[PDB]
Amino acid sequence: MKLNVDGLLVYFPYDYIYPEQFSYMRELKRTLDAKGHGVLEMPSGTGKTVSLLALIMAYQRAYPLEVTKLIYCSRTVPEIEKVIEELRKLLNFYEKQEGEKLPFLGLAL
Amino acid sequence: VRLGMMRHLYVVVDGSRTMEDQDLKPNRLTCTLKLLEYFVEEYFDQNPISQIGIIVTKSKRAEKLTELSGNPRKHITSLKKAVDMTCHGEPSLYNSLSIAMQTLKHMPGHTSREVLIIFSSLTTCDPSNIYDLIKTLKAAKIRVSVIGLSAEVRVCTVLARETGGTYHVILDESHYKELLTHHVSPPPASSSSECSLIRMGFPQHTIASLSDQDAKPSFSMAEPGLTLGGYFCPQCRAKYCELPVECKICGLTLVSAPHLARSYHHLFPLDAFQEIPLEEYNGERFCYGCQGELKDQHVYVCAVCQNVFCVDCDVFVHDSLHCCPGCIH
Amino acid sequence: LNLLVIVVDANPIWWGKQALKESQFTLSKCIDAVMVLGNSHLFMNRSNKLAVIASHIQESRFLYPGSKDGKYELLTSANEVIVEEIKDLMTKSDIKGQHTETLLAGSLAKALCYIHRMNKEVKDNQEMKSRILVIKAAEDSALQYMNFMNVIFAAQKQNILIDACVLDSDSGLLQQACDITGGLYLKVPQMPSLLQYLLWVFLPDQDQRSQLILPPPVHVDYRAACFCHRNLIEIGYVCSVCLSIFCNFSPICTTCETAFKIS
Amino acid sequence: YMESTVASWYEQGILENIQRNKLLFIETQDGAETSVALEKYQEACENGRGAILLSVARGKVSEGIDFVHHYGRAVIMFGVPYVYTQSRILKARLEYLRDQFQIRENDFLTFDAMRHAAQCVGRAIRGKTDYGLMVFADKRFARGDKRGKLPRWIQEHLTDANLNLTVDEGVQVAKYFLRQMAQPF
Amino acid sequence: ANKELEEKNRMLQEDPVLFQLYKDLVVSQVISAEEFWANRSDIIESIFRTYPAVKMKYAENVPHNMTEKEFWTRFFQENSNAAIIKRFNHHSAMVLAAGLRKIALNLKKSDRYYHGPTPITSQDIINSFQSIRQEMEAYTPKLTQVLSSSAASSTITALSPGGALMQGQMVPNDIQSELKHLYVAVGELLRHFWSCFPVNTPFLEEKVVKMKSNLERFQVTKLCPFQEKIRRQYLSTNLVSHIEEMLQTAYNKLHTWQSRRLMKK
Ligand SMILES: [Zn+2]
Ligand SMILES: [Zn+2]
Ligand SMILES: [Zn+2]
Ligand SMILES: [Zn+2]
Ligand SMILES: [Zn+2]
């Protein structure tokens, strides 16, 4: 599922995304393009993590110099474990799409 | 898709006091029993070879309201008697499923053993864990398809999906009718299911030979008076009042040809007819099925006979007749 | 009220055989007798309604959806429509040597769905007790057993009485059919006097049939046979898929191809 | 407050009827008891007994735990979550915010209540489109300010027709909504 | 343990039919009775299963110079505030613990169904078709042609009870019960005799029991005809021959299968 976002093309593992996901991605891309701190709210407990991670990875690929790395913080370790699971699934999907390993590292402290 | 024509089905009814709650227009238990009477009669009318059994569970104990039998009237009478049941206590899935398992364990392998638990009170107080019983159920290949009421019970969800049955929750009374009518039909046979030949016996109605000469008087076999004539058995040689029935001596099913013929339509399902609203060059005002003018913008057609049927004709054909009138030709 | 449906088996082969034989009985007189029966049925009451179906080897067609002789207008219309349509159907007909057996299951299916349509359309205030007065006139076809049994069971569920009036031949399938739904079975041996049989045995409706003396039902031989040589068998070995009555125990029934496991 | 309400229900017959209808579990300050109670609550949810877990909005259990399908199906909020008006730490935290950044004391207090309530009531919609209803048993939430400060996604679903339902009307509409959600897509 | 004796005592009078038939098998001294069986509050209980402490207290305080009413009285009897919450948590946990005590089908021949078990020149069709086409150029002959009085009278006479197509006793009451009882006895013993008869059972230990049951057939049918004789010599009316068919057919099956076994050997 490759989404032709206004800023660029962004990969996505799951089949379909709700319109609220489109709005989230476009607003997040606007904030990153402005390179200014901002705040936004999304209802779903899950799904926001995958959309955010996919958009950040695509933005990193497009403008690697713009963003050095992502620092994604969660309330509790049991919760951040689910985030690392989501990131692992996304990386597996992207690796299958590309056909080879890429210099991408992701870890939890 | 392989289908199990012969199935021994147990309709497990719960006499919980949650059944007391009148969520439906009449009392919940009364509505369930009234509709289950129709379910029993229709099940026997759509699967004569099959047989049914009712287990009523209340106050943490399960009692066999009626053992396995081929007579719908006896089960109907049991339902009518149970309508007045006190309806106080708490059900036990372990107890009910264990009773059903005890009765169904000695049943023949070829027949499909099935259980339909009409679950009303979400609670399940059991002497022993039911997850262990799930393993025995899977080993015994007893299909269990729960129908929950006003609750999506997790233990019953896992029961249904693990044992191969289906789980549902009542949206309303109309949907309850649909659920039970759907469960009436035989379920498809899965990989675990196995088929084997079953001995069958076909009796012939007999009467006095000639002017009551060398007659065969007899009363019945399960206050029966003397009967001049009736059904018999190839081996029992014992008079039977009504068919189909299992032998009380042989253990062999006695059943006539029409009863078997009643189930051929299951093997031969009717392909759905495409619904075309527009006339589509159909200049015949009169519907072929009913020879009546099409008052609605709807038409149905087969892939072989290519005939024209109205809404009522198509609905009736796919519901009850189970065969296309003109396409028979 | 009562909705009567006369399923006449007007088989051209057999009725034309009668015509060649120059016998006293003729299809014209049979149609006249059926017409008189329908007229009397509607004569019984205004609310009562009737319909007629004619059977042919190819298909089956409905014969029924001023007072020139001082006649009741409705019955006059019935007479004219049935006469014209039956003459048209008999006059126009293709020839197919391969198919000559009379068709009855399709006609009965048409009757059943017609009765269902009328029951839907009629007001719920009045209850309708439909009936099908089948009048067979030729031997049945073996290949029609399955469909005929389907329609018979549908009639049983829908509560319609199949009153059979076979003549010149005793169709075991048809007698079995009417026995299931409880309809009467009369085998008239005097074809010229057929109409008297209708105005007594068949004409009275189910409401009054119980409180009336009618000929006793004929014994029905519910025979079973194996699919090999077609002969009566008292013990059948059916499987769980075919549900087919067979000859003797076999490693695998041909109509199934299942991997039966011995034991 | 939870203990007082529980004690009153125990003195009356309501609590026994609730126990009969469904199992009841309560939260305590001690983490060991909290964990044991929640562990048993999960098994109760899996089984048909069901469970009613009484907890505190500020309780660490509320923030740590996440409710998913067939877990915390109906989220009940008994009273607007407000911290005691005697803890002097909040007095500094609040009057300083009034002095600097110009936030009204009542504004910040209602914000602290609404944010906490949204935190403790937003779990049922975790993911996978699992149905569930959030009932707030307090007329205060019906006030416009509370509704306005409520998160947009919940508020837009909320309507004036069901804004101030009586207890019985709320029960009936909850039953109907559960009926609607029971059926498949 | 005399479990068999206890079961016999339990069913001695609770169920009349079971003991009646079991005794009948011995009344004429047919066979030993060994083979017969060889071949074939709420609140206190809830507390008992709820509170293990109450169970231990009951065990230690079993009624001894006390009264159950006093024991009942003992039941109901911030520090207290937290005790209530703890008590509900523990009680619900105890209740929960008590409840958690340890193939697509394919076919090659379908016309067999189209012609099921029900059993069963060219110019003739042309001649019949043309003749019937020319038959009905005249219509509406109803005035006289359809029916005639003589034929109608013949039809009515036929419909008369003595006519064609229309062909046209509960005196004993007390004998009915005796016949029913005898039929029940025959069914009871035929059940075990036919239990494994249809199955070949080519095993020594399996065949021993069929041999014993086959001898039991002789031994029971020895006594049946004596009661038949007693009943027969009353009026010589309303013969009861259906019972004879069961015995004779069982004997025929026994002897035929014995001959088949000898042939197989
Ligand atoms: Zn038998
Ligand atoms: Zn139609
Ligand atoms: Zn068709
Ligand atoms: Zn054969
Ligand atoms: Zn087969």
UniProtKB/Swiss-Prot annotation, chain A:
Places the protein is found: Nucleus; Cytoplasm, Cytoskeleton, Spindle
PTM statement from Swiss-Prot or TrEMBL: ISGylated.
Protein residues bound to ATP: M42, P43, S44, G45, T46, G47, K48, T49
Function noted in UniProt: ATP-dependent 5'-3' DNA helicase. Component of the general transcription and DNA repair factor IIH (TFIIH) core complex, not absolutely essential for minimal transcription in vitro. Required for transcription-coupled nucleotide excision repair (NER) of damaged DNA; recognizes damaged bases. Sequestered in chromatin on UV-damaged DNA. When complexed to CDK-activating kinase (CAK), involved in transcription by RNA polymerase II. In NER, TFIIH acts by opening DNA around the lesion to allow the excision of the damaged oligonucleotide and its replacement by a new DNA fragment.
Protein family per UniProt: Belongs to the helicase family. RAD3/XPD subfamily.
Domains (record comment): Interacts with GTF2H2/p44 via the C-terminus of this protein; mutations in the C-terminal region of XPD do not alter its helicase activity, but prevent its interaction with and helicase stimulation by GTF2H2/p44.
Protein name: General transcription and DNA repair factor IIH helicase subunit XPD
Organism: Homo sapiens (Human)
Gene behind the chain: ERCC2
Entire-sequence positions represented here: 1 to 109 of 760
Swiss-Prot record, chain B:
UniProt effect for mutating C287A: No effect on the transcriptional activity of the reconstituted TFIIH complex
Keyword Repressor: no
Recorded consequence of changing H322A: No effect on the transcriptional activity of the reconstituted TFIIH complex
Localization, UniProt: Nucleus
GO biological process: G protein-coupled receptor internalization; nucleotide-excision repair; regulation of transcription by RNA polymerase II; response to UV; transcription by RNA polymerase II; transcription initiation at RNA polymerase II promoter
Effect ascribed to mutating C233A: Reconstituted TFIIH complex lacks p62 and has no transcriptional activity
GO molecular function: RNA polymerase II general transcription initiation factor activity; zinc ion binding
Effect of H318A: No effect on the transcriptional activity of the reconstituted TFIIH complex
Top-level taxonomic group: Eukaryota
Keywords, ordered alphabetically: DNA damage, DNA repair, Host-virus interaction, Metal-binding, Nucleus, Phosphoprotein, Transcription, Transcription regulation, Zinc, Zinc-finger
Protein name: General transcription factor IIH subunit 2
Organism: Homo sapiens (Human)
UniProtKB/Swiss-Prot annotation, chain C:
Primary location group: nucleus
Keywords linked to the UniProt accession: DNA damage, DNA repair, Metal-binding, Nucleus, Transcription, Transcription regulation, Zinc, Zinc-finger
This protein's GO CC annotations: core TFIIH complex portion of holo TFIIH complex; nucleoplasm; nucleus; transcription factor TFIID complex; transcription factor TFIIH core complex; transcription factor TFIIH holo complex; transcription preinitiation complex
Record-linked InterPro entries: TFIIH_Tfb4/GTF2H3 (IPR004600), vWFA_dom_sf (IPR036465)
Subcellular location: Nucleus
Protein family membership: Belongs to the TFB4 family.
Role description: Component of the general transcription and DNA repair factor IIH (TFIIH) core complex, which is involved in general and transcription-coupled nucleotide excision repair (NER) of damaged DNA and, when complexed to CAK, in RNA transcription by RNA polymerase II. In NER, TFIIH acts by opening DNA around the lesion to allow the excision of the damaged oligonucleotide and its replacement by a new DNA fragment. In transcription, TFIIH has an essential role in transcription initiation.
Gene: GTF2H3
Keyword DNA damage among UniProt keywords: yes
Protein name: General transcription factor IIH subunit 3
From Swiss-Prot, chain E:
Main location: nucleus
Record key words, sorted: Acetylation, DNA damage, DNA repair, Host-virus interaction, Nucleus, Phosphoprotein, Repeat, Transcription, Transcription regulation, Ubl conjugation
A GO term for molecular function: chromatin binding
The protein's assembly and partners: Component of the 7-subunit TFIIH core complex composed of XPB/ERCC3, XPD/ERCC2, GTF2H1, GTF2H2, GTF2H3, GTF2H4 and GTF2H5, which is active in NER. The core complex associates with the 3-subunit CDK-activating kinase (CAK) module composed of CCNH/cyclin H, CDK7 and MNAT1 to form the 10-subunit holoenzyme (holo-TFIIH) active in transcription. Interacts with PUF60. (Microbial infection) Interacts with Rift valley fever virus NSs (via OmegaXaV motif); the interaction leads to TFIIH complex proteasomal degradation.
Protein purpose: Component of the general transcription and DNA repair factor IIH (TFIIH) core complex, which is involved in general and transcription-coupled nucleotide excision repair (NER) of damaged DNA and, when complexed to CAK, in RNA transcription by RNA polymerase II. In NER, TFIIH acts by opening DNA around the lesion to allow the excision of the damaged oligonucleotide and its replacement by a new DNA fragment. In transcription, TFIIH has an essential role in transcription initiation.
Similarity comment: Belongs to the TFB1 family.
Protein name (record): General transcription factor IIH subunit 1
Gene from which this protein is expressed: GTF2H1
